[PDB]
């Protein structure tokens, strides 16, 4: 039997001002610096350690790890920060308020665009500001791996190579692993180890910075799972996710 610990970066600028982020660089605030700090220090009291973590190249990610890390005294592990655990990407909508966006394009087609399975939020131009091409984090990745746009199925497939060619195997080493991660990104694996079905996972909504325990037997099969920390300030937390709402 073996333990894997899953946590939402936690609250970032985007969050808070309820903007469609995707691949865009934004930074935590405050709120998620310390929620980052109490998922730390609920682990530490919980005696949980880890040997590894593996997060995205995004800084609201790696920051939420950084204040683990910090709080449990692990600054010293090794840490893989891949693209491939990088948030969904939102493509167009990436930098767009999600409540004026319902407003202008129906609360469904925005339920469609954050939640279902295969269906794409329209894509970046290839010449777009925002477009990954340039980017020093990316220099390595070809070309057409690279998305202007990606539907949950894509974050999926772009997820599961760092799971099968370095995280599966880091946990039947022994190892005892952090992922730091994203809401969407977060999604798919979980779809994945789950079984989870394309139906089903619309409605799974991951609440920022709390630590998410999945118990796997010796076939990486889940056993069961569980968010640590109070289940009230949780659900609360789940329901405030539920903001692709219109404005006035």
Not at 64 to 90: A, I
Not at 104 to 111: C, I, N, P, S, T
Not at 156 to 162: D, E, I, K, T
Request: proline share 6%; aromatic share 8%.
């Amino acid at each position: 039997m073996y333990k894997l610990v899953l946590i939402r970066h936690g609250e970032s600028t985007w969050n808070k001002e309820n903007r469609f982020t995707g691949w865009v660089d934004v930074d935590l605030t405050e709120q998620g610096n310390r929620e980052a700090r109490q998922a730390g220090q609920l682990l530490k009291e919980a005696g949980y350690t880890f040997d590894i973590a593996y997060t995205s190249v995004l800084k609201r990610a790696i920051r939420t790890l950084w204040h683990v890390q910090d709080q449990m005294d692990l600054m010293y592990v090794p840490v893989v920060h891949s693209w491939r655990l990088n948030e969904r990407h939102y493509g167009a909508l990436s930098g767009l308020n999600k409540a004026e966006t319902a407003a202008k394009y129906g609360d469904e087609q925005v339920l469609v665009w954050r939640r279902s399975y295969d269906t794409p939020p329209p894509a970046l131009e290839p010449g777009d500001e925002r477009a990954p091409y340039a980017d020093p984090r990316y220099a390595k990745v070809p070309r057409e791996q690279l998305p202007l746009t990606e539907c949950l199925k894509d974050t999926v497939a772009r997820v599961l190579p760092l799971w099968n060619e370095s995280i599966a195997p880091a946990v039947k080493a022994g190892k005892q692993v952090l992922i730091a991660a994203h809401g969407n990104s977060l999604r798919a694996l979980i779809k994945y180890l789950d079984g989870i079905s394309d139906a089903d996972i619309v409605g799974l909504n991951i609440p920022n910075g709390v630590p998410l325990v999945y118990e796997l037997d010796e076939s990486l099969t889940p056993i069961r799972h569980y968010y640590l920390g109070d289940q009230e300030a949780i659900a609360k937390a789940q329901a405030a996710v539920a903001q692709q709402g219109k404005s006035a």
